Amino acid sequence: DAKNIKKGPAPFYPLEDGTAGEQLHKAMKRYALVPGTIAFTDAHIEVNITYAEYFEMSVRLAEAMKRYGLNTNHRIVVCSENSLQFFMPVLGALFIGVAVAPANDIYNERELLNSMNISQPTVVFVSKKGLQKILNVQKKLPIIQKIIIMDSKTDYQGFQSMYTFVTSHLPPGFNEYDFVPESFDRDKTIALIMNSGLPKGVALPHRTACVRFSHARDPIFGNQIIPDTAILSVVPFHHGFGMFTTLGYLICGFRVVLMYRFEEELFLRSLQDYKIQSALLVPTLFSFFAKSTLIDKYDLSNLHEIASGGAPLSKEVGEAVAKRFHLPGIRQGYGLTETTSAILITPEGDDKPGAVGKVVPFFEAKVVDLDTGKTLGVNQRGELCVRGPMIMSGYVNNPEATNALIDKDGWLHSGDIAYWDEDEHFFIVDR
Ligand SMILES: Oc1csc(-c2nc3ccc(NC4=CC=C4)cc3s2)n1
């Protein structure tokens, strides 16, 4: 110390001001003004929704929730499998500083109850197939006073859709392109309450999404903003890996192709036909594609990268997948729910097998001795600790669990074993 604290380089672009709502609003308004720019594509049903459509419905949902009465003292739950509609109430609530709690749509009723007992939402957005579970949770959590169906146009089984709800509360003359997103304190207004014994609520201020948005547009730590870039994401939107890659893709103006049910031929054909440049996989899908022999039958010449993951993958698995996809390697990244997003990212092209990446801008990371907490040195194995502005502000009504994890020095103890090498690539040791 000082040379055993690994530091992230400066951001290519300075850190934008304003809330996460404001930066999303600003970027998506610009993309909305180009007709036909695609935001999301559902691979199963083949429908595209454009930035204009997405911007206007999100702005309308923002103003409708504001006029309903929701403010920074309220939370919503968005409970739905990955869908064209998922990010509409997410964006609307961020535009007005209402915290959003994504609800694992393959939670059973009990997992659902505990998730929402922590987040205490006033309004629930849910897909049709989640409705009866929400209703049963409402019997035990009557703070849920309003339930809105996401994947309907008309009312559904007595409940308003997002479209009928918006119509009920927009003022006459509402103009989507005059709407101004709320300004408020970036550090103290919670953007997301993510789920991590029993899961905890992880409160993430807007600031931490604003920092992710720096990483997402970064030419080294994210993606170059280039027109007609398309992503294939098969990662759940309600978990932090899918939440904050997708928001970053929206701020980049990318086309986000989604699948909520993995199928081998549909995935490969979607890579081919949508000329996908980046594909996102959960760890166990890497093992799957290590076994796949169909990859050669598809034109994947546009494929530039495959990114992971919660994980970390084995070095052997990542090398086998990379070979099959005729790529030089896998672009890994590492983070926890409590760090918002990845705080260790494989730099563009700076690719190394088994490595999880380097420290991201605004962060620092070290490896401490498992017995003493002392800062270790190159290739020394110990506990990974990270410090930076994407760390959560704490667990929700659980300051004891918060303090076990983050000291007064603001260092986050990942509970993972790690080491960094000569060129400062981090590796995670599997326990
Ligand atoms: O558990 C948990 C919560 S958040 C999270 C991750 N976020 C990212 C983001 C990017 C990435 N890889 C970049 C994308 C170009 C390489 C890997 C990961 S892993 N994991």
Distance CA 329, CA 47 (A): 32
What is the 293 CA–ligand 1 centroid distance (Å)? 27
90 in Cβ contact with 78 (< 8 Å) = yes
Residues 6+ apart with CB under 8 A from 42: 83, 84, 258
What is the 10 CA–ligand 1 centroid distance (Å)? 19
If one counts the domains in the chain, the total is 1
Ligand 1 atom with the shortest distance to the CA of 337: 3
Q: Tell me how crowded residue 398 is: count the other CB atoms within 10 A of its CB.
A: 14
Strand order in the sheet with 412-420: 6-7, 364-368, 382-387, 412-420, 426-429
Per-residue DSSP letters for 374-394? -B--TT--EEEEEESTTS-SE
Secondary structure class of 77 (helix, strand, coil): strand
> Of 23, 27, 42, which is closest to residue 233 (Cα–Cα)?
42
CB of residue 237 inside a 6 A radius of ligand 1: no
Ligand 1 atom with the shortest distance to the CA of 280: 14
For a substitution probing ligand 1, which of 239, 345, 351, 358 has the most ligand atoms within 8 Å of its CB? 345
What is the 356 CA–ligand 1 centroid distance (Å)? 10
Distance CA 296, CA 310 (A): 27
Ligand 1 atom with the shortest distance to the CA of 331: 16
The residues that bridge with 195 in the sheet, in sequence order, are 201
417 in Cβ contact with 423 (< 8 Å) = no
Distance CA 231, CA 413 (A): 32
Under DSSP, the state recorded for 131 is: H
CB of residue 342 inside a 6 A radius of ligand 1: yes
Q: Tell me how crowded residue 62 is: count the other CB atoms within 10 A of its CB.
A: 29
Distance CA 130, CA 109 (A): 10
> Of 247, 203, 138, 218, which is closest to residue 337 (Cα–Cα)?
203
Sequence-ordered alpha helix ranges (H) in 198-309 = 206-217, 240-251, 264-273, 283-291
Distance CA 132, CA 129 (A): 7
CB of residue 276 inside a 6 A radius of ligand 1: no
Resolution (A): 2.3
**Residue at token pair 């929206």:** 250
248: domain range? Answer: 1-431
Experimental method, per PDB record: X-ray
Domain of 46: which CATH number?
Answer: 3.40.50.12780
Under DSSP, the state recorded for 225 is: -
Distance CA 431, CA 426 (A): 16
For a substitution probing ligand 1, which of 211, 215, 241, 414 has the most ligand atoms within 8 Å of its CB? 241
CB of residue 21 inside a 6 A radius of ligand 1: no
> Of 425, 429, 430, 417, which is closest to residue 369 (Cα–Cα)?
417
